[PDB]
């Protein structure tokens, strides 16, 4: 599909049994969600943006369904003010910018 | 052009006769550039950042050329990690997300 940018490019994603609304974010290197228990080991990480940094947990090889496309990769979990899909998963579903 | 996301979507812009690199950012409502001096009136503004609100200067109706595509709109100037082109100007240049 083609998603215009008049509005925030928000989509509902699925990880296991869980739905989240998340923003397709070409300005994010990484995918970050709030309020998510995920399976497996995790390591602390700090990620930055406008305003400064937040502390997150890094989980690897996590399946994320995005518009019928199956991504698998790193998901960060922490107090992000918006759930975010970053380039690490956008690339896997074949997402590009076009103008 | 078509810009893939294996690398940061950095492009050259021209603003006030200056060339700068900027990130095409679908996760940003607004365009925020690093500290620089711009034309005329500006309004003190606050934008919601990580950990709270950050002070920026708001300049309205500024011409910005992005990969040779013309936009005229609001540019914020303040402490950003990167020059960021947000949806306010991505829409003007006809930028979409596609997969």
């Amino acid at each position: 599909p083609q998603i215009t940018l008049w509005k925030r490019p928000l989509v509902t994603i699925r990880i296991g049994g869980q739905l989240k609304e998340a923003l397709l974010n070409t300005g994010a290197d990484d995918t970050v969600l709030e309020e998510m228990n995920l399976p497996g080991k995790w390591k602390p990480k700090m990620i930055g943006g406008i305003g400064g940094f937040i502390k997150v947990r890094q989980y690897d090889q996590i399946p994320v369904e995005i518009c019928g496309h199956k991504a698998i990769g790193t998901v960060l979990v922490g107090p992000t003010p918006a759930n975010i899909i970053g380039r690490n998963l956008l690339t896997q579903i074949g997402c590009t910018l076009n103008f | 052009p078509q810009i893939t996301l294996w690398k940061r979507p950095l492009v050259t812009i021209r603003i006030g006769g200056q060339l700068k690199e900027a990130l095409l950012n679908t996760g940003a409502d607004d365009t925020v550039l690093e500290e620089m001096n711009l034309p005329g009136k500006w309004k003190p503004k606050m934008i919601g950042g990580i950990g709270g609100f950050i002070k920026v200067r708001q300049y309205d109706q500024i011409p910005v050329e992005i990969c040779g595509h013309k936009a005229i709109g609001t540019v914020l100037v303040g402490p950003t990690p990167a020059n960021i082109i947000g949806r306010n100007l991505l829409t003007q240049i006809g930028c979409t997300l596609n997969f």
Binding site: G27 | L23, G27
Partner: peptide, 7 residues
């Protein structure tokens, strides 16, 4: 690393 969300 940079997640440049912006509201």
């Amino acid at each position: 690393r940079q997640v440049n969300f912006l509201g």
